[PDB]
UniProtKB/Swiss-Prot annotation, chains A, C:
The gene is purS. This is Phosphoribosylformylglycinamidine synthase subunit PurS. Part of the phosphoribosylformylglycinamidine synthase complex involved in the purines biosynthetic pathway. Catalyzes the ATP-dependent conversion of formylglycinamide ribonucleotide (FGAR) and glutamine to yield formylglycinamidine ribonucleotide (FGAM) and glutamate. The FGAM synthase complex is composed of three subunits. PurQ produces an ammonia molecule by converting glutamine to glutamate. PurL transfers the ammonia molecule to FGAR to form FGAM in an ATP-dependent manner. Keywords: ATP-binding, Cytoplasm, Ligase, Nucleotide-binding, Purine biosynthesis. Its EC number is 6.3.5.3. PANTHER family: PHOSPHORIBOSYLFORMYLGLYCINAMIDINE SYNTHASE SUBUNIT PURS (PTHR34696:SF1). Homodimer. Part of the FGAM synthase complex composed of 1 PurL, 1 PurQ and 2 PurS subunits. It comes from Thermotoga maritima (strain ATCC 43589 / DSM 3109 / JCM 10099 / NBRC 100826 / MSB8).
Length: 84, 87, 84, 86
């Protein structure tokens, strides 16, 4: 069976109760060194991937499983998914 | 100034290695998903997702600041490309 | 200046009042031989492309130029654009 | 029984897989870049098939679309495809 393709980008971020010192350092550079009025800078991960699946709902289940099983730490991270 | 409101505009920046740059970290992750987790994912690429807020008179000026941040620091123009979206 | 990237899919189709004999033939095969209840089949073009530009309005302008200067024959075709 | 059978509209976006060379696409990208001066990259030219499918529900309609791809519309060796509702 030739299955349809579904492309995604997963946006993984630390939750709001986790400080992000790397993000803070970057932000300090932009503000103090580059003079840019930027705030609440957070450095997370963007995972692009695609999957062949029987339908869109199955594709999302695969995406969620990849997050649950490997990509996202449920205690410290949250994620959003978009279609490409 | 004069207690005038200054709006905040939130963005995400998706910074990815260009296609001619190898991504061995992504390859490792893809292989775990496929071979250890049994998930038929492919073309996996691992980049960076930077969320930030910008204080500015209007969204257009805020967008210019975001692009300046990428040029000046956030994106390596040789090995990375990037996409900005409003959050 | 390192400009942001904008990704698109262009869907080029014949206008509703242009006949599509290739579409009609494909539809005949799918219905008569393959037994599939398909109708109004239209064969058009899909062009995926990425543009660098200063903002989303300029990027759309680049897409419109690409259509008007090459990709779309205005006499017999129309297009839709979607973001990827 | 004169029972209503809904139509469901879909678009199939058919493209060559990434390991397949697309001289036509390459040509078009060169023309847009070099002849029209446009800042365009990674151009891929494929097929866009619009169709309507008469079926009891959308899920059954979608199954028919995939069957149409398998049986005729998509080359399994060199092409991939995405389906969306219109």
């Amino acid at each position: 069976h030739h299955l349809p393709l579904f492309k995604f980008a997963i946006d993984v971020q630390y939750r709001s109760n986790v400080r992000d010192p790397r993000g803070e350092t970057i932000e300090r550079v932009l503000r103090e060194e580059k003079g840019l009025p930027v705030k609440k800078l957070r450095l997370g991960k963007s995972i692009h991937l695609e999957v062949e699946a029987e339908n869109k709902e199955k594709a999302y289940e695969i995406v969620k499983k990849a997050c649950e099983e490997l990509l996202v730490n449920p205690v410290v991270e949250e994620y959003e998914v978009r279609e490409l």
